[PDB]
Design a protein around this nucleic acid. Sequence first.
DNA 1: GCACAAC
RNA 2: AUAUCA
DNA 3: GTTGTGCTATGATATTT
Lengths: 274, 85, 178, 550, 189, 171, 112, 87, 97
Amino acid sequence: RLVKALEDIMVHYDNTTRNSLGNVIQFIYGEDGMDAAHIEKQSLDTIGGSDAAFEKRYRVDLLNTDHTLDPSLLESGSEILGDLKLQVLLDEEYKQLVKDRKFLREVFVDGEANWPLPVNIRRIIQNAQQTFHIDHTKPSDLTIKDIVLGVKDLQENLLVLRGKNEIIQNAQRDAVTLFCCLLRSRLATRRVLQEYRLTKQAFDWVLSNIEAQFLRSVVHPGEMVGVLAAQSIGEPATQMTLNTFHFKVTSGVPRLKEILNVAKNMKTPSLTVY
Amino acid sequence: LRMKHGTYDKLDDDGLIAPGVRVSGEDVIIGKTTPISSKRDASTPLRSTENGIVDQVLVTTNQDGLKFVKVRVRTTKIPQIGDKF
Amino acid sequence: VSTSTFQTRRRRLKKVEEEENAATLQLGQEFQLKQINHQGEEEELIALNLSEARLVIKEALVERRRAFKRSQKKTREKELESIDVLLEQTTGGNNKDLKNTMQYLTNFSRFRDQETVGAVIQLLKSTGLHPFEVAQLGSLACDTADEAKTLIPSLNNKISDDELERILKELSNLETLY
Amino acid sequence: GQQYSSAPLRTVKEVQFGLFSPEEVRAISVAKIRFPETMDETQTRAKIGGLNDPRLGSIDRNLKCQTCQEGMNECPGHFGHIDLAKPVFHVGFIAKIKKVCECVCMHCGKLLLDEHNELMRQALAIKDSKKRFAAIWTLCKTKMVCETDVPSEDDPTQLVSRGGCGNTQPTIRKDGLKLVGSWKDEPELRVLSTEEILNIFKHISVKDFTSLGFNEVFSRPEWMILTCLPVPPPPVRPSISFNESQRGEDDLTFKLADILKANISLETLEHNGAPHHAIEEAESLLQFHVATYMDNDIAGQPQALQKSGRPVKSIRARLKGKEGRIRGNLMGKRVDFSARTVISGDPNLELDQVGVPKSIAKTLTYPEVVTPYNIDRLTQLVRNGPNEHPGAKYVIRDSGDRIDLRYSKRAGDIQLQYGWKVERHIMDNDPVLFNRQPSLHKMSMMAHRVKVIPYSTFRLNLSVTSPYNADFDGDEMNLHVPQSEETRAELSQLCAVPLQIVSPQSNKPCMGIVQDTLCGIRKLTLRDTFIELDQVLNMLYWVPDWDGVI
Amino acid sequence: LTCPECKVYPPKIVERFSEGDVVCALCGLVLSDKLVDTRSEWRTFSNDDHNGDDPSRVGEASNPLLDGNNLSTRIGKGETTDMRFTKELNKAQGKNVKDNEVQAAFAKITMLCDAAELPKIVKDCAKEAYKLCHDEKTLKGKSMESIMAASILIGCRRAEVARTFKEIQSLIHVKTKEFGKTLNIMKNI
Amino acid sequence: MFFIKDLSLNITLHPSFFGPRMKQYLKTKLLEEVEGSCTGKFGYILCVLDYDNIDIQRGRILPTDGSAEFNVKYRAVVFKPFKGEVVDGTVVSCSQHGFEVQVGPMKVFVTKHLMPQDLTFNAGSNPPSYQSSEDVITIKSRIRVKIEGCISQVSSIHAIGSIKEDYLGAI
Amino acid sequence: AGRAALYKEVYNVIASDGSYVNYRHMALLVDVMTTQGGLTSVTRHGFNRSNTGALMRCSFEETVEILFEAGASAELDDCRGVSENVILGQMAPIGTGAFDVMIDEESLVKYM
Amino acid sequence: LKEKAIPKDQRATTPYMTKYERARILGTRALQISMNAPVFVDLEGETDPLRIAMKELAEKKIPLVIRRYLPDGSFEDWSVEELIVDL
Amino acid sequence: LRFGEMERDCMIAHGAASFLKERLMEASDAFRVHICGICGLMTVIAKLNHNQFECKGCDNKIDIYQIHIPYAAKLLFQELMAMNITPRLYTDRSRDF
DNA sequence: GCACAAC
RNA sequence: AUAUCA
DNA sequence: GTTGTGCTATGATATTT
Ligand SMILES: [Mg+2]
Ligand SMILES: [Mg+2]
Ligand SMILES: [Zn+2]
Ligand SMILES: [Zn+2]
Ligand SMILES: [Zn+2]
Ligand SMILES: [Zn+2]
């Protein structure tokens, strides 16, 4: 029944999800436009922790002796101190970071950090160190501008939806909202220089790989998405054993019938009052 | 008409194989024709997936006296790979 | 593999709809005058009188001999002969249909030169009759406006009796004396 | 093969459903069908100018198919007609027919509710033909009078006269396969006869039945009532001639003969002195046979049974269930170039390989096409013959002529021509679809790489057990061989095992290390575990990807 | 069939049923590809399905030698059935019902064999002996209950079922010399 | 009459022709299949114009065999007779039943009964002719005919004509 | 809000077994049940009562009663469903069938 | 109507080749090659028509063109020369 | 062996469209009928030898397409016709989309 | 034997 | 049709 | 309120009239 109901749902060449009638079901497959097989659980960082430790991790204050970047972290660090033009970039960067925070907390209200997102950024930073033999004791040749403006320019390249009009472009910005939140939390100026100790060469490679991997992760038009969905649900419903085990709401297979039949007379009706 | 591609040589003129002859796939154990007019072939071949040696062959008539013949085929099945235990 | 046209039609299942064709200018569904270009623009029907048809085909069969020699890189009575040369060079040779058409066109054409044909084309196009009628007027030589309106009943009242006689006068003059 | 036709090959783009106009049924038909006799020109061996091939389809390995010729493996079979004595209901629309009658004025033919009515104006606005009929019916099933006089859309003071006729409408109810009316001290009750209905429907206006969902060209109400009967050709109802005293006819051929017999009977009754009640008695017999032929599982009615006590396989019932024509011959069907056997595990195979018994590989075939690349290699295969493993079974010429290599005397001599095909044995590294039922998700069918091995089992790597859900307790699996160069590309590029490793079902790999290897990979990994030189060299060598550096 | 390439008068051809092909044994040319299983195809007409669940079971076998070609189903009770419509449609078959009635003399042979303890192969020979001699001018006007009493010994004398003429004199009836002359004018036919 | 028509044919190419002389083979296959054919729908397709600008377009590749199907758009001169059309032509045959007049690629038959009163078939003439006092119609003369009707036999179009009315006949 | 609670209730049935299905698959099912305007059941009188192709609807559960109605309503099947092309034995418009491949003479003369 | 051909600029689909597009191109070309279609690449001893088609595809010398149908009837033509292969 | 519904769902979920087609046609049923292009019926009297066609009833000898469909599909349409239903097959579209 | 659909 | 197989 | 109407796991294999 599940298959025969999702049969003709697929993704079309405008990254939309329609049936044999052209009726729109989803506007961008999976709401993100990503092919499920290319997704991995990743820690969203930003979302949790104390405000105090968040500040310790992301804030850079080139205008303050203590909270600036130590000249051990980069070459330009000694002549970076007090640079008013630059500090507006980092102020922007950190303002955008705290925006993401209050947003992620509006999206995952329980504060869960680990969600499935494409492109494993943690393993790209790893592969960048293993590759360029990053020296965790020598200053990098990155400029604040190199890092900050680089990550802003990458973001504009992670396109799922092309389309010159405004509506499509908006649906584009929206489908990359959560990924870019992850992205800014991992290539934040401080974190790049202090925790990853990347070099200009490594950093540029990392941004290159991110873009190329992101592209590889978007759904291919033609993907039968619906049959795929029915099987993805039908199959583990077979492995379902209740078959309780060692031993008051109806769960498992018989409850799954109710849901699909939209049975008006359900066995275990209840409501959780807070 | 419509003879079986299998071989009929193992048949004695009574249309039966004598017991003791070794058989094999598609070979003709019992020769039969259904005259209609000269006559079509209604013979019984050994199952194509099997083989062995004919164990015993008996000729009889039934409750109303129709000649009918039973043929036993013996094989020895030696444990092989896909076999279940 | 049945060669198709330039226009579309709704298959109402009732094949019983086709009408006949006459000299009430009811040509086919195919040959009605508002028809469509390969580029998709709506142009008018093209019916040729002979002379005009004889030139189109001749001009086209020569454009074709050219192209065949390119790819090779890597008096009326006299014309009847030259034409049969051009055919054995450019056509499939089995084309008895075209071979007769050229013998016919070559023997029945009133105007020989492209200039003369153009003169007929100019003259007959101020009258704004059907393209079928101007073709007939270019093919059938007539002396009286009655002869015309008898052999081309499609006219009757489209053009005046005396204005049509003016035209037959100018056609008779343009007529090539082989 | 199947011979060439100059007709343009096209694909089906639209399917236009409708009902058969009796005019059309008559027009298509290539035979009259007059007699309930099968063949037997009285104890003979030829078809009777009456039922199956009166002029019709052809069977029995004989061309004769009315000029058309061709015979069996080309002839689609063409239809005959049967002219019914009186109209009868098509069982499928007894429903609809009753509903239409409730919507239309009987004896008049007008719709019971106008655009003048306010709720009907709304129903008539509906876009879906099906939903519109629903609304319209629910409105004027209760309208029990054909109005002549109706208040205008200005004010109820002056009435505007709509369509005439001012009769009472019967409350129509279904009694068996008959429709019974009732007009309102004690009402008038009688049976609406088919001829009435058929006539009332014809009078229904084109704009009216169009509003009722019908369509002026393809599906008119009057065609819900059967007047002419399309007779299906033998292909749809095959016969078999066993041994001159045994002959098998299809249940439809039986059911048809009853329709005919019942028809011939009622025709004689009407022609003769019509005894009214002895005719309607014979009509509702005809009604039954025709009805029971399209559907034998009818609620309320007795089933038509076939001597042995079994009920006649109606047409409905052939399409219906799983194992029907839809679920079981179209949406799924058995296929050639397939194989099945017991699986067993093999730790010495690659993940993407599959162990194929030599016996199976010698039976299954791939029709490789001769080009000057494989021309030498194929000539050797043909020359091997179908007995030795690396060889071939058939050679197919350009004409479509196929030659059984096991019967040609100059087998190795056949000078292959480019464009000819050679059906060769499945060889090592040919791509195959491997499948274990029930195929619950897409990893239950994966493209593998043939390794021809001995013994009678399919051999697969253990880590591939997890998605097929196979244990080796006597499980069997299915192999399918692609036949096109194009179709194997679809397997190798899309369905291939190594591709299916990371699954979209749950964004994680669905295949892992299992059983022995999982258990032993722990015992190898302990800090206690040390290995000495002699056995280390053996482990190293055992890795095929070893860089040769101790 | 005969191979178009070879053409030798005894056309040596094999039916490779297993590959579903008809081959010429000499040149190897395949002469046909569509090939059908007659056993399983015959299983669709004469099966073991009396219940009605088999989707393969779709026809029924008949006997064109004995009852000619009379295809006819019977109105009977089904799962969802009112006992009213069965009666009406059966009372309607009564109005639709001479030599098409002399087939009830098969019911005379069948009820005689079952009273004489005779096999199913004997009845079908007695019914074929009776169908091919009951309208003969060579029998003309013989005792009509002694010509079917003679066609039972004709059916027994081929099916190898030992039945003396005095054994059939006990059944019906038989007038000895009357069904003895009739047992000879038919024997010539 | 004698029209120029915008037509399109579907040719299918087997992959082995997917070489450099592809467009050439196609235009050739067009001139083979279309030129000198005859259909009820368009008449006699006599000659294809502008051999250089024949549009080959792109070829959809069929999904079973590798072959590729094109929709070749071309312009042609056609000939389709109509009832009521008046045509000049030549007599090609002449029997006791009438005579045929070859007009363009098509013949038109003039039955002896759509002929002037006194114009009657005389068989003593060599060759047999129609011999009025002021007319002689035989196997080579030029005639003006009025087409009384056409018969479509999808391979050729044949027609029947009259010379009875005013302004017709010999010329 | 019903769409959400419907995903939530389905999610619970999968997570109660300790299993995990990627959000999109469940969201797709749920999104399908609700784009009609209300809760469309995955049953013979739900999803199979929509206005899709007639052969498609007939391949699940109601077969003949769907084809009779298809006849009297003079339905037209546009053959975009996978079911139709399978019944018809044509290359389905799915995956490898979601586009078309054509030869270009211009560039073929370029490469050779 | 054939006005539903979206022009070269104004194309808006992925400039990357889809996994099925590539599968069909390889299959299609391999097929034609095995049907003796001319080969547009120096086969360096290669004999398997799929292996050859892959060599054609990695040299961008397949003269095919994907016609991408949109759900409303329109289409965008892309040539394998221009599509990006990153699979 | 039976390539069933569930085995079909898998070949779809994979996107292997041609494989599905080959498995359902070449690997099995695979029949060719001629249809009239006026009524979408299969009532054409195709005498392939004489290259004559014609669908009388439409009196059409010019508008005929040949198509490739499963025999079981041809069986299905003939059975629907048997029941008065007209499964009309057309080779051109008329609907947009 | 359900469970939901129409009388 | 029963029995059975995973 | 009652009736009435669709369906109810995938494939496989072996006999019995
Ligand atoms: Mg198991
Ligand atoms: Mg297991
Ligand atoms: Zn035929
Ligand atoms: Zn009325
Ligand atoms: Zn031979
Ligand atoms: Zn037709």
